[PDB]
Every structure is written in structure tokens, then in C-alpha cells.
Design a protein around this nucleic acid. Sequence first.
DNA 1: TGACCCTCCCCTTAGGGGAGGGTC
DNA 2: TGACCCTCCCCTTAGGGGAGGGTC
Lengths: 277, 277
Amino acid sequence: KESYYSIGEVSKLANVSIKALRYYDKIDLFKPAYVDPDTSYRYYTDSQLIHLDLIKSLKYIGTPLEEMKKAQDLEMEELFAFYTEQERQIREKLDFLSALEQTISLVKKRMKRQMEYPALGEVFVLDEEEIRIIQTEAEGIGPENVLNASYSKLKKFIESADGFTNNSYGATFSFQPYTSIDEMTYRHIFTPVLTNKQISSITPDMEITTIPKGRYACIAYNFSPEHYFLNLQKLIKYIADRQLTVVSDVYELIIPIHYSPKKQEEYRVEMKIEILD
Amino acid sequence: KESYYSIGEVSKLANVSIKALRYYDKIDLFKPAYVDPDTSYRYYTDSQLIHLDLIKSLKYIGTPLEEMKKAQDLEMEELFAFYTEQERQIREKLDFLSALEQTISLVKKRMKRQMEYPALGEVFVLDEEEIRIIQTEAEGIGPENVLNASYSKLKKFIESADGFTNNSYGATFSFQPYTSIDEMTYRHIFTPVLTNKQISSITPDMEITTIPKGRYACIAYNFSPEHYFLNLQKLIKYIADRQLTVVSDVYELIIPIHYSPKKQEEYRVEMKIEILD
DNA sequence: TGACCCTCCCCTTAGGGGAGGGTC
DNA sequence: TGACCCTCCCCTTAGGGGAGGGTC
Ligand SMILES: CCNc1cc2oc3c/c(=[NH+]/CC)c(C)cc-3c(-c3ccccc3C(=O)OCC)c2cc1C
Ligand SMILES: CCNc1cc2oc3c/c(=[NH+]/CC)c(C)cc-3c(-c3ccccc3C(=O)OCC)c2cc1C
């Protein structure tokens, strides 16, 4: 071959855009063998096309362009090693996605349950599967003064293990025949965990524990101040009327119904307490 | 809570950079509840922090920011569906990586073999595993006039199934006791395939076939014009001397030793021909 | 006074999409 | 004359890193 291909010809032959070729030229990754000193037209030799092989392959596996420059200088012995590295980075991506895929599925599972709920505003008993959680003591906090900020450390922690930060906020309190909200004080506030990912060195002010599998007397509803205490009361009454035995704190879970800064915020609230008989 | 968090406070609480908050502000994704009309300082309410939950989660799974705007307007019923979509896109990514991971491994396998080679310039017989390939007739082409461009359609095709374009170039020719290069003409030129990926509607001028598993008389060496024909001759002689029976065309494979536009190009050449006795 | 916050401004990666003007 | 090619120039995404100057 003693001619020359024009940019368009290379483009059509190698299945690479003309823009790409001009760019690889500027980058000094793949430069035409000859540039007409007047028209500036780019001209390529046939033998030179071989170099687009490595470039197109590396582009396919995501290698950044500047990285390619040092990959072409390596050499069949080291290129083998180079690939070994790309592999390790690929399995890294894979592991990440698999984990991610598992998490999304769990979020969806829990998300679906809050949609299958028997009825709102009514107490009912059901067999629950366990729920892993991370908690910390409430230090004075109660329904009237809890803040999103109160969950900062817990969230920082779960975020580090799940990536997918928590959706629901939890709190617990002693099952008592309260007569007023102000009488209530939280024992712990918690956020459920979604991963069995070996917790990133948990500090001792946090406790990894669980809302155990068992029978629970529950009530769920869409939050409204003049409903919070009444639903609690329905739970208290329900348990007293059928003489049930409470064997846990009252578990309280709050989950936003939407995250739109545009519409009036609304929350789903759920109170459950484990029972025996 | 009847105060206000400053940008720095939100940053520390939600584990999101200050720059990020300013940006989410500009984008109109997450805007502070209040902006001091004089200092321009941004101020946020505690209740508002809840919105960073969805945002941080979507950012974790790769959802583009502008996409988030429409995700917050959706609503626990549709958000479920939204996640289902993200899942489908995640498995898409996974499948891609797995395939990619398999390919890289095969490239490495073949790449290693050409490094384990017994010796260069010497004929030797070995048991080969099959090699899938895609070929087309050579139409007159021979060792003296083959061009990289000659492989354009074949490459376009393999690229579509492997992503990782071919590394080696092949050709075949009738086993004859040639006395000169010019007497040689290729029957087919081919590129090996690396994927069992249902070939993207192959046209009939191409043939999916194989260099079959079997015993081959081979010779590999680093290309040099005044060596090409001599090595062929060593093969011819080797086969005649031990009276072997040839049962295939001569398979010729060329692979660049490096893809550096900076150093003198060099190639590994390999000729193999299947035999019986 | 230190921290804290704000508004530019430049910069990163891999080209795609023109617009205006030559060029086999 | 159509195709073909070239050189700007603007633009995309998600902020990070300052620089210069106010601000609890
Ligand atoms: C077990 C999960 N724990 C939580 C429990 C909560 O119980 C609350 C009871 C109330 N009771 C009246 C008797 C009122 C007024 C607000 C409450 C908030 C609240 C705080 C700040 C801004 C908005 C809200 C808010 O509107 O939250 C919806 C529950 C709240 C928040 C969390 C995290
Ligand atoms: C089975 C694979 N098929 C191929 C076989 C080939 O055999 C060749 C034999 C030769 N023999 C002299 C008797 C010479 C001179 C060049 C050859 C080239 C070649 C063509 C253009 C630019 C550089 C080279 C080049 O330098 O290629 C290295 C082989 C070549 C290319 C391919 C794809």
C-alpha cells in the first residue's frame, strides 16, 4: 500500500468517528502519518491502522485515553499484567453492582410491605420476620423534640455499609399506659440496616441489634398530630382488652411518603410491640 | 426546631460537601429554606434534611441529578416502579461486566500461549484446542498485497459481538511445495471470535467456522521478510521428511508484539497445519 | 481575630453538533 | 458542483480547587 487513507476513509474502515480521530490526533494518542502542510488534511497509512486495535479495545473496557498512551508503550509481557489489573477493576465493579442489586431489592421488599398493609388506623396482629438495626440511646429525646439531625451519626454509619442511606427512622419507648405525650420519652432511636456488610468499625455508643422475629400488635397510619397519641391509645387498649402480654418496647417507625420539596410533606407512621398469647 | 442550620452544619450532618449543597441549590434540586437577603448565606430547616435521603440514595446508584428532580415528585407507588427500572439497568451493567470479564480472560489465555511457545524458528508438533473464527474468501489477496483494510468487514463484525476487537489477523492457503512467495495466494483471511454471543445477523459473504482441535505442525517467529518464506519451507520440509499427512490448509496468524506508534513495529507470525500420523 | 460562607472563575473527560470557509 | 475536510466555538455532567472579599 503506497497511497494514504483520508480521515473519512479511516473512519469508515475502523468504525471510529472522524471527530474521534481528530481528537486522538490532538491528544497525541493516534496521529495521522501525514498532514498536508497547506490544506491541513489528515492522511493515514494502512500499516498504522493496527494501532486502533488496542485503542478501541481499551475504550471498550473503559480505560481513560491518557491511560492508553502508557499502555501502548508497554509490551505483550506487561500488557498481560495490564489486563490482569483491568480484570481486578472489573470484578470490583461487579461486586459493587451485585451488592447494589441486593440492596435495591431489600428496599423494594420493605417498600412493598408498607403498601400491602391490612388497614390504616386499625390495630392488628401479625407474624413479623426479624429486622436488623443499629441503635443508640435517646438521651432525653422524645416524640416532641426528635430531630432529623438526631440521626446523624447513625445515618453516617449505615450509609458507609449500605451506600443506600436509610429510608425509615425508628425509636423505641417503654410500653406504659401513658395519659399524655409529654409523659413519653424514647429509650433508643434507630435506623434499620440493609447489609450484612461487616460494619465499618462500629463505635461502642452504637449497638447492632434487632427487632426480633415474632408476633406483633401493630398499627400504621399517615401522620397527623391529633392522631399520634390516639393510635398509641388504640394499641394500649387493644392489648389490655384481649389481655395480651407485651414482651418488648414499643417500636416506632417513620417513613416519608414522598421526598418532594414542592408538596406538603407527609409521613407513614407505624407502631408495633411484640406479644405472646 | 426553630433555628436553622448553616451550609456547613448541613454538610457535616448529611455527609455532603458544601460545594454539593450549593450546586444542588443552583440546580434547584435541594434549596435552602432561607437565604439571607444581604449576606446571601444559605439556611436550612431540620425537617428539610429528610429530602437528602432520596438524593444521596439516587446519587449512590448513579441516577443523574436532573433525573432526581422527577423522582422526588413521584411517590412511593411509582418510586417502587422507578427502583424496578434502576434494577433492570443494574443487571444490564452486570451482564456487560461479566461478559467483559470473560473476554479479557480469553484474550489473556491466548496472549499467554504466544509467550509459552516452545521455541521460535523451529517446527514442532502439538495438540491444539479448537479456535472459533469468522472468515471470508481472500479474492486474489496474497502475502504480498494483504492490507489491514482487507479485514474491515470481518473486524466490524467481531467488534459487534466481542466489543474487544480482534488482536490477531489470519489467512489460509493451500499446502503446496511452493518455490516462491509470488506463487502463494490466500484462500481465506480470518479473525478469530472471542464470544459465543449470537452473532449479530451475519451476512452470507462471511462464514463462521473453526480451526479444529487436532494435531498441528507449527512454527512461530518474529516477522522479518527474509524469514517468511524460509520458515514456510522448514514446515514443508519437516512434513516431507517425516512423511506426515496434511489434512487442512496452512493457517497463518499475525499478531503485533506492541501497539506503540513510537517504536519500530514488530509482529509475531505463526503457521500451523493439521496432520495425522 | 480566626472560622465560616459567598461569588466568580478555571478545570476535568471524550467527544458531538454545528457554523463558516476551503477542498478531491 | 456536491461530497469531503478543517478550524474554531459552544456544550454536556457533577462538582473540586482556589482567589478575593465579606461575615457569626
Ligand atoms: C420513630 C421515628 N422518629 C421520629 C418521630 C417523630 O414523632 C413526632 C410526634 C409529633 N407529635 C404530636 C403529639 C410531632 C408534632 C413531630 C414528630 C417528628 C418531626 C420532627 C421535626 C420535623 C417534622 C416532624 C414530623 O412532622 O414527623 C412525622 C412523624 C418526629 C421525627 C422522627 C425522626
Ligand atoms: C495471516 C495474517 N495476514 C497478514 C499477512 C501478511 O504477510 C506479509 C508477508 C510479507 N512477506 C515478504 C515475503 C510482507 C513484506 C508483508 C506482509 C503484511 C503487511 C501489510 C501491510 C503493512 C505491514 C505488513 C507487515 O509488515 O506485516 C507483518 C507480517 C501482512 C499483513 C497481514 C494482516
